[PDB]
């Protein structure tokens, strides 16, 4: 189909999750995730889907796609696909996690929307980590700003052909 993006929020070290939680509290990043994904397709792995609250999934106003090897998986209000390539048939897709799906998706992706949270969390065994980019990606790293709580963050908007 077409435009494949990745979206995530990471500490400066690349930690995106620890102990099965987002490792900070940042409502403005929830607003940012909505504004990027709203009206488009989101793709997630089955474990990510399983971790969302029952009354929160599917995320509203977006086509939710769950990748699973299980043909009988129940993702009420979403659709389930059994290959990544089938999950990218939409005109605009944002891959939202987790690490297994980001690995599969990275070769197809031509945009990354990232939030860096200014927090010092050196990586530990078991952490969920950010996809690793390289020098063929280009774009803007925004200015630091404070959240309402005083937590600082900035935005990356990168692209490649
Ligand atoms: N090549 C592939 N084909 C189909 N489904 C896949 C896949 N790779 C990953 N998945 C699914 O995506 C799941 C992992 O989800 P995730 O990426 O959210 O997890 P994690 O955050 O642990 O990396 C896999 O366990 C698998 O779902 P099932 O266990 O239900 O089969």
From Swiss-Prot:
Domain DHFR, residue spans: 3-160
The residues that hold substrate are 7-9, 29, 34, 62, 102, 115
Question: Which InterPro entries does this entry report, sorted A to Z?
Answer: DHFR (IPR012259), DHFR-like_dom_sf (IPR024072), DHFR_CS (IPR017925), DHFR_dom (IPR001796)
Residues annotated to bind NADP(+): 8-9, 16-21, 45-48, 67-70, 82, 96-101
Q: Which Pfam families match?
A: DHFR_1
The protein's matches in SUPFAM superfamilies, at most eight in alphabetical order, are given as: Dihydrofolate reductase-like
User: Which GO terms fall under molecular function for this chain's record?
Assistant: dihydrofolate reductase activity; NADP binding
Q: What superkingdom does the record give? A: Bacteria
Please name the pathway. Answer: Cofactor biosynthesis; tetrahydrofolate biosynthesis; 5,6,7,8-tetrahydrofolate from 7,8-dihydrofolate: step 1/1
- The answer to whether UniProt assigns keyword Oxidoreductase to this entry is yes
Naming one, the record's GO cellular component terms include: cytosol
Q: Which family does the UniProt entry place this protein in? A: Belongs to the dihydrofolate reductase family.
According to its UniProt entry, the function of this protein is described as: Key enzyme in folate metabolism. Catalyzes an essential reaction for de novo glycine and purine synthesis, and for DNA precursor synthesis.
The protein here is known as: Dihydrofolate reductase
User: Which species is listed as the source?
Assistant: Mycobacterium tuberculosis (strain CDC 1551 / Oshkosh)
Source lineage: Bacteria, Bacillati, Actinomycetota, Actinomycetes, Mycobacteriales
